[PDB]
Enzyme design. Structure first.
Site, PDB file in Angstrom:
ATOM      1  N   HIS A  88       0.844  -1.186   0.000  1.00 41.04           N
ATOM      2  CA  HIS A  88       0.000   0.000   0.000  1.00 41.04           C
ATOM      3  C   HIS A  88       0.882   1.239   0.000  1.00 41.04           C
ATOM      4  CE1 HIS A  88       0.748   0.883   4.310  1.00 41.04           C
ATOM      5  NE2 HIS A  88       0.261   2.075   4.014  1.00 41.04           N
ATOM      6  N   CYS A  89       0.360   2.321  -0.575  1.00 40.47           N
ATOM      7  CA  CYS A  89       1.040   3.610  -0.518  1.00 40.47           C
ATOM      8  C   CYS A  89       0.015   4.692  -0.187  1.00 40.47           C
ATOM      9  CB  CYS A  89       1.785   3.898  -1.822  1.00 40.47           C
ATOM     10  SG  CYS A  89       0.791   4.399  -3.217  1.00 40.47           S
ATOM     11  N   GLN A  90      -0.432   5.448  -1.190  1.00 41.09           N
ATOM     12  CA  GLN A  90      -1.389   6.527  -0.962  1.00 41.09           C
ATOM     13  C   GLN A  90      -2.410   6.528  -2.097  1.00 41.09           C
ATOM     14  OE1 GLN A  90       1.601   9.871   0.442  1.00 41.09           O
ATOM     15  NE2 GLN A  90      -0.356  10.094   1.521  1.00 41.09           N
TER      16      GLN A  90
END
Ligand SMILES: CSc1scc2c1-c1nc(SCC(=O)C(C)(C)C)ncc1CC2
EC number: 3.1.3.16
Length: 147
Positions: A88-90
């Site tokens: 996951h990131c943004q």
């Protein structure tokens, strides 16, 4: 909540998706890759998952290629032990989708384009980043030339 399954054991999301401990647990996730620098490692205090932070920014100068094989080895740990990984990131999923595509090129025999299509069909919103597209092009050449 929208934890997209790319492979049975590999999931893709953003910051908001990674804060659901109830859905992460339902999907048999025991590994988390956080491809940011500032966000917290969500649910680290509950002692339920193994974590990895790829300290990256969404900049035109960020190198994500340095992190590829550090990720691929953490993904394959999960693949073998029978658990799921959440990278996951943004919001745009620019960074985390970059790593996901990279793994699909090295361990599935896809091309860069087929990988991008495979991933866009399941998570329809991946915002672009020209910096990362160039790094994938280089990676595609390095694999075909046996490197
Ligand atoms: C490696 S991308 C690729 S390969 C073939 C095409 C594309 C593409 N990608 C994007 S968005 C970029 C992404 O998804 C990240 C790089 C941030 C993971 N827009 C348009 C296109 C045109 C067709």
């Amino acid at each position: 909540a929208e934890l997209t399954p790319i492979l049975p054991f590999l999931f893709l999301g953003n910051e908001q998706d990674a804060q659901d401990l109830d859905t992460m647990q339902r999907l048999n996730i025991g590994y988390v890759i956080n491809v940011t620098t500032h966000l917290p490692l969500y649910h680290y205090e509950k002692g339920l998952f193994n974590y990895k932070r790829l300290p990256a920014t969404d900049s035109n100068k960020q190198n994500l290629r340095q992190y590829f094989e550090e990720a691929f080895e953490f993904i394959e740990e999960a693949h073998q032990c029978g658990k799921g990984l959440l990278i996951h990131c943004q919001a745009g999923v620019s960074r985390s989708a970059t790593i996901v595509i990279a793994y699909l090129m090295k361990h599935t025999r896809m091309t860069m384009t087929d990988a991008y299509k495979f991933v866009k069909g399941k998570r329809p919103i991946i915002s672009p980043a020209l910096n990362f597209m160039g790094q994938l092009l280089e990676f595609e050449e390095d694999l075909n030339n046996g490197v």
